[PDB]
Amino acid sequence: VRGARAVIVDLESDSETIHCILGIRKIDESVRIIAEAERYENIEQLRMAGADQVISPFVISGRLMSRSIDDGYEAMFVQDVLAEESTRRMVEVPIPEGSKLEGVSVLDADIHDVTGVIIIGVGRGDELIIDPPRDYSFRAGDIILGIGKPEEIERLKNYISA
Amino acid sequence: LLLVLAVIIYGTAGFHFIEGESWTVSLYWTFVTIATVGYGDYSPSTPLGMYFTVTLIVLGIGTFAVAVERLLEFLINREQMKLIGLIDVAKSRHVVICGWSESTLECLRELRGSEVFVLAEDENVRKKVLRSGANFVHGDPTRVSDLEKANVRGARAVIVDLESDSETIHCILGIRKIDESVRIIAEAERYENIEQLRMAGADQVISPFVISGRLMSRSIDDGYEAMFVQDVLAEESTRRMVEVPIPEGSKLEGVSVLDADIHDVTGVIIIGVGRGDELIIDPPRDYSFRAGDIILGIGKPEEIERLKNYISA
Amino acid sequence: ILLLVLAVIIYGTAGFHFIEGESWTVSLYWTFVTIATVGYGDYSPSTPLGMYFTVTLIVLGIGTFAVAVERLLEFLINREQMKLIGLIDVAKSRHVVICGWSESTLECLRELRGSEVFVLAEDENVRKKVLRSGANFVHGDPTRVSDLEKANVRGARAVIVDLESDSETIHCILGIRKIDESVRIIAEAERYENIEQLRMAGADQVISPFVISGRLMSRSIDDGYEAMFVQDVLAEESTRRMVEVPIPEGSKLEGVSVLDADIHDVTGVIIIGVGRGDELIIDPPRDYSFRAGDIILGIGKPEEIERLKNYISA
Amino acid sequence: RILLLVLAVIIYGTAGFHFIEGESWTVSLYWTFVTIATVGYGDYSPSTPLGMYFTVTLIVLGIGTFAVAVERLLEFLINREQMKLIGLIDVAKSRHVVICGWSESTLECLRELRGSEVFVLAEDENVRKKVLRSGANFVHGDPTRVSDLEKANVRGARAVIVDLESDSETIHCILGIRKIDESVRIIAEAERYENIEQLRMAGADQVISPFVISGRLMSRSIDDGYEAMFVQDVLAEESTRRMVEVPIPEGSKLEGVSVLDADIHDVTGVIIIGVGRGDELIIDPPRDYSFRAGDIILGIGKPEEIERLKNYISALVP
Amino acid sequence: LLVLAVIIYGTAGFHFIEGESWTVSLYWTFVTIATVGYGDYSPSTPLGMYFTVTLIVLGIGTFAVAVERLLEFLINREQMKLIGLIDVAKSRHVVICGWSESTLECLRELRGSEVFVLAEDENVRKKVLRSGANFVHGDPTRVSDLEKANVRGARAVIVDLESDSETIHCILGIRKIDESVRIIAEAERYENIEQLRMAGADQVISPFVISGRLMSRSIDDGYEAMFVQDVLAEESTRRMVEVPIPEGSKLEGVSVLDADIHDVTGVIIIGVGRGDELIIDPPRDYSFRAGDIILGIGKPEEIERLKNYISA
Ligand SMILES: [Ca+2]
Ligand SMILES: [Ca+2]
Ligand SMILES: [Ca+2]
Ligand SMILES: [Ca+2]
Ligand SMILES: [Ca+2]
Ligand SMILES: [Ca+2]
Ligand SMILES: [Ca+2]
Ligand SMILES: [Ca+2]
Ligand SMILES: [Ca+2]
Ligand SMILES: [Ca+2]
Ligand SMILES: [Ca+2]
Ligand SMILES: [Ca+2]
Ligand SMILES: [Ca+2]
Ligand SMILES: [Ca+2]
Ligand SMILES: [Ca+2]
């Protein structure tokens, strides 16, 4: 575990998951820990134990269920963007240092028009802004969350450099 | 059954001759002496009745105790028949949940405010279900006679998560033997049986472990992928993900989405557009909006309102 | 449910109001006595328009009341608990919460005779023993936070945690630290291999009895006095009690070295250790300067306990 | 019995090579050992077809018997371990310790008995792996069956330690021990307080009730945990203070000397928490306790000041 | 069939591919396949060095096929063939269906007889061998498995299974094979001793009924239970023996009182056996017929005396 890229933890019960996480942090207190949460009631308890990211697939499912009564496009969206069988892949693209976009407003940049990548969100460290407002200034090192074909991602990666 | 009448008629005789009452006065006495009401309109007027008073206390008590249990059971099935009568009017809009899992629980928490029935084979869940806000129906969701007990026919939709995928499939078949048109949403424990669920009549299928495992993998490098899905689904964020329908005879029918500049015009992100039973993610620029198309987008509730107007005639 | 109770009540007060000719006051006491079989006597059927209405109202009213009386008591077992549950408005370190029912938490409870303690357990049959040991019982999963709140862990004296596994024990502690993050948490550890994990979760004090027992065993091979001591001080059968004594501000001992203080000579109380915050020094050196607030750990007779308690004040 | 049959194929080959090709008693044995062990050096091939039959059948049937010897040899590799074990049980003047049951306690006990001869006896086979990495020998057997207590050489052991799954089984084991060595020291863990006496009735010398200890420490740790901090810290070797039992030899400078007259804490710095008279211990002895010979002094102190008590206590020179 | 494959490939590749006789070419195959590889026929041409590797593989498969299948078959066949030619086997064997504490304690008294245990639980195998009996893994209710214990032509079959139903089910299966072989069966409930006999149980022993009655009789004084348990152990010097009255007896027609057996031989006559029924404490005027069976307690020395006192 020490000198691992990350550790993914899904054990039979949430207690055992936690108990595992604490043990990890008693070895490599910085290695990335991703953990599955069976109950919503203890997402926070998992994070307290040192879980860096927490995915609770039953909470996702139930909410997708409810949204799939009227029309199922919500659940259709989530599942298809995540399969590489869909040509649209969901990629995180970094803004290089000394960017052509540093300081450029997202509206001034017209990324959707320029590269065809849909900007679903923009990442500032460990927090994410979905559908950024028009007046969001691109800083360097921001992370772009987007959907697009592999060809139009390569275009954004060039459009973003110095 | 017939034994309850025996003590009643037996009392009407010991008051008809042994206390000097009519058949109508003796019958009204026996029904009150059995319920220990002792209102008082007929007390033993002769020691042949005061003897009959002591003796009928045993015979009258037995008829009262047996009748309440059978009538309450007949009032509990009638309450089951009267509770069944209330779901039929609410039925053009009710939702039936087959199985009680963590998935179906968190779905129910987002259906706060609808007529919902949970059907589960384990009884102790009833307390949890009621403190969660739904009606409970004890039954095996594979037996059709219990699906009928939840008025699955003519429901808004039925949601199905059972212990295994085999039971889930079996249940869907039971539904389609009642309402072959009701919307069926079902979770699949294994990816290996998504198609089998759809073959059996599942209209929409959600596989949360495939969602999970994939978010896990994408959370190693950077966790924004997993962060996106989970946040769009909580109603607490100002960005809501809404399906917007394109009315017939729209300002957009035949208008290209590139000519529409919807993100530019209304600020709503267009992540996909739906034509019937399929959804196209990041639609191409030259997609003609037909009538009835569904717009899948994220946006502020204000800029959603702009999309709803910008799309009309 | 409550619609059946209104039926016998409304139909009887009306069937005596019109079908027997009574006021609302005579008909309701008629229905309330005819349905409840009280038969106080203020309204019996004086006409067969009532004698028919009596039997049908009393039968339907006796049957509807019988279903309703239990429903009221079922609401009176939870709502009378809800008025008593509403009564815990103290904002004080009064009660003690014990999470889990093991043999340890039983032996602990037997030494808390005279205190108000709450046991929180997921297994229901435990209720009989808990009451016969002197505590109140709360049915709930001590890992669920909404059930920790059912024991008012928030603003408790301390919480004691022994669950079936160490994983469950940890999970509970983390939940506690999500309500009252300062309450003292005492937790039992089944494996030595994860004591640190228990403290990481927020347990202030951790007791691992298999390590105690294992170590006492090892020491009882040759001669058993090591084990004999630990078990004997903890039973009140010895006249010697083991007490923690604090050093107040303005002591006759404040700043005085323990050798110059010569506590063993002065008071006869054995000084096995002195406590500084969250750490303890056993058999302190002769040249230990007592600071204020130090805790003195000692064994002695109840008479000589008072002497050290006097010797330390102004 | 079946393994006893394996020796036959070698001799039949030693017979099938002695006459069917004309070899001596010395030549017949050297031929079979290469044909059966598949070494096949090659010094004897069929010079008449009558030998190729007796060779091939005896080489094949004997080769199967040669391979079978490994299983007996693996048993023979356990008997050579018995010749090395005989050298270790006579290393010093202390004999071995038997641990009946594998609990978390006996695991923690075994970990502090590093350096004594220890044998664990448990009916669970998978326990064997943990026992070896914990440093003791394992014996697969039911510690209630006496024929399996005997398999752990309980007679003439230093002591036997008993923690079984239930208190009932523990008792049965103790009684089993006492049907062999009615004097060997028996230490037993008690899972319920309700039957300590029953454990001693069966012949248990010392009984440890870790739930009674623990339950009581909790009750006392609510306010401040120095009590519990004390017990656990005296028992870990990480603290510099050791808790030692010191005996008062016959004819001591202290025989007849009061514990107050001895000024032991002042003289030696060792804290005297108790003194032992046989199978009972007096905690915080009264000021006028007369030290007799053979009494045991229970005290805490640094290794240097332990040395001080050991001399201040010793007997006068002849 | 695998042994023939390497044999055919090897005995020809040394007869033709290197020039050896029919006896020399096959002798090459038998050592190279068993990896003995003595060496008297090695590849003298690469045409043999090529087939050597293939024959080393093909011969290894036949050697493994010959070693695993034949040696297991050579250990069980050696038990049936060496027993037939070296020394004789006294009488037919015994079958024990089920492995309980009863059938275990039964085996302790059949030390030195050919016994076969049939039980469906495999791990029982080791204990049975160290008890001195042979083991057969099978369900004693399935008839095809009773056939596996040679029930037919057994001396007797002893049946104690987990439940009384399974015991019965077993008994009926036996009688569907050897409808005369002696069947002894343990009864867990008194309520169905008769049902066991209906199924064909010749003798029925119900050890819990014995125990309970011994318990009750052991309250006042325990000599009853002391008697039963000690007469049955050979640790007691008194053994309980069945002695037959030979044809043309010295006692035939002699009253038991006229015979004074207790006085004459010291054997206590606890009962006398007339076929499948037993008379306990016979009356004084019981005439000894020939072939009657005497049930008695005595030391081994005084039994030999009765056996002489009883002859012609
Ligand atoms: Ca999982
Ligand atoms: Ca929808
Ligand atoms: Ca695009
Ligand atoms: Ca599920
Ligand atoms: Ca990523
Ligand atoms: Ca926007
Ligand atoms: Ca415990
Ligand atoms: Ca010792
Ligand atoms: Ca003292
Ligand atoms: Ca234990
Ligand atoms: Ca304290
Ligand atoms: Ca010192
Ligand atoms: Ca049995
Ligand atoms: Ca008796
Ligand atoms: Ca005799």
Author numbering:
A (entry chain D): 175 to 336
B (entry chain A): 24 to 336
C (entry chain B): 23 to 336
D (entry chain C): 22 to 339
E (entry chain D): 25 to 336
Which text from the study accompanies this structure?
MthK is a tetrameric ligand-gated K+ channel, related to BK channels, and consists of two main parts: the TM (pore) domain, containing the signature amino acid sequence TVGYG of the SF, and the gating ring—a large cytosolic domain with Ca2+ binding sites. Binding of Ca2+ ions to the gating ring induces a conformational change that expands the ring diameter, which in turn pulls open the pore-lining helices. MthK consists of a pore domain whose pore-lining (M2) helices are tethered to a cytosolic Ca2+-binding module, known as the gating ring. Here, we studied another K+ channel, MthK, which is closely related to BK channels, at a wide range of AG openings (~2 nm range of the TM helix separation) at positive (depolarizing) membrane voltage, and we found that the channel conductance is tightly regulated at the SF, with the T59 residue, which forms the ion binding site S4, as the key residue.
To further determine whether the missing linker segment may impact structural refinement and AG diameter, we acquired a crystallographic data set of the full-length MthK to 3.1 Å resolution. We then completed the structure by extending the linker segment to connect the M2 helix with the gating ring, and refined against our data to an Rwork/Rfree of 0.228/0.275. Here, we compare crystal structures of full-length and truncated (pore-only) MthK channels, to find that the AG of these structures are in distinct conformations, with the pore-only AG forming a narrower cavity than the gating ring-tethered AG of the full-length channel. Consequently, the channel’s conductance is regulated at the SF, through an allosteric coupling with the AG. This idea is supported by crystallographic evidence demonstrating that the AG assumes a more open conformation in the presence of the gating ring, as compared to pore-only structures. A88 is known to be a constriction point in the MthK cavity and is important for ion conduction. For the AMBER force field, the position of this current maximum (i.e., the level of AG opening, quantified by the A88 CA distance) is very close to AG opening observed in our crystal structure. In the case of the CHARMM force field, MthK shows the maximum current for AG opening slightly larger (by ~0.1 nm) than one seen in our structure. Maximal outward K+ currents are observed for AG openings almost identical to those seen in the most open crystal structure (up to ~0.1 nm more at the level of A88), and in a very good agreement with experimental currents from single-channel recordings. Available crystal structures of MthK show distinct openings of these helices, making MthK a good model system to study potassium channel gating and the AG–SF coupling.
